[PDB]
Each structure stands twice: as C-alpha cells, then as structure tokens.
C-alpha cells in the first residue's frame, strides 16, 4: 500500500476555483474547540 498520497476531506468551507490549500490545522467537528490536539470531534484534515 502506497500511503504517500494524501487528500483533504475535512474543511469548513468549499474552495474557490484554482485554490491550493496546505493548511494542517485540525478540523473542529464538534462544538468544543480544538487547541491543536486531535481526538474526539477533533480530526486531522488529511487522509491517506
């Protein structure tokens, strides 16, 4: 399995045309804010 290719499935808004997003900021799914720590309702924005 070549897990070196990544794609983003978590973002608060849809992209504009010709946009390139390199944000590593943790997606906030729940009401509780995520202060840089992932876990429950705090997910990494990239998937392999």
């Amino acid at each position: 399995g070549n897990y070196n290719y990544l794609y983003r499935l978590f973002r608060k808004s849809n992209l504009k045309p010709f946009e390139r997003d390199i944000s590593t900021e943790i997606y906030q799914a729940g009401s509780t804010p995520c202060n840089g720590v992932e876990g429950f309702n705090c997910y990494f924005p990239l998937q392999s």
């Binding site: 504009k16 045309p17 010709f18 946009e19 390139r20």
Partner: protein
C-alpha cells in the same frame, strides 16, 4: 520560493489586487511639487506585473 525576478518631488501610485490567485500590479509615475498631500488631478495606472502567486493575502505592510 516559487518565483524570483531581478530587474516631495516624485509621485508613485500602485494598485494591488489578487483575483483567483493572480496578483495584478498597476503603476504610474509622475513628477510632483507638493509637500501637503496627494495633488488634485487625474491619471491612469497601467499594468506591468501579473504574478500567479496562488497565495491567500489578508494583510500587508509597507517597507521604508
């Protein structure tokens, strides 16, 4: 480092806008003689640089 290019008595006016990742630069130079503010008049700025940065910009700072 995706791009690198190397090339009051005067008035320098500039327009900076970023639409769809394209940074468009307009400019116009003219000599002036005024120490209070911008002189009252009309002039047209012309484009010289169109740089496809693809970079989000929300704030800027002027260097002296």
């Amino acid at each position: 480092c995706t791009f690198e290019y190397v090339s009051f008595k005067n008035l320098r006016e500039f327009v900076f806008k970023n639409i769809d990742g394209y940074f468009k630069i307009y400019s116009k130079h003219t000599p002036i003689n005024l120490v209070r503010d911008l002189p009252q008049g009309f002039s047209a700025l012309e484009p010289l640089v169109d740089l496809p940065i693809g970079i989000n910009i929300t704030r800027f700072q002027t260097l002296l």
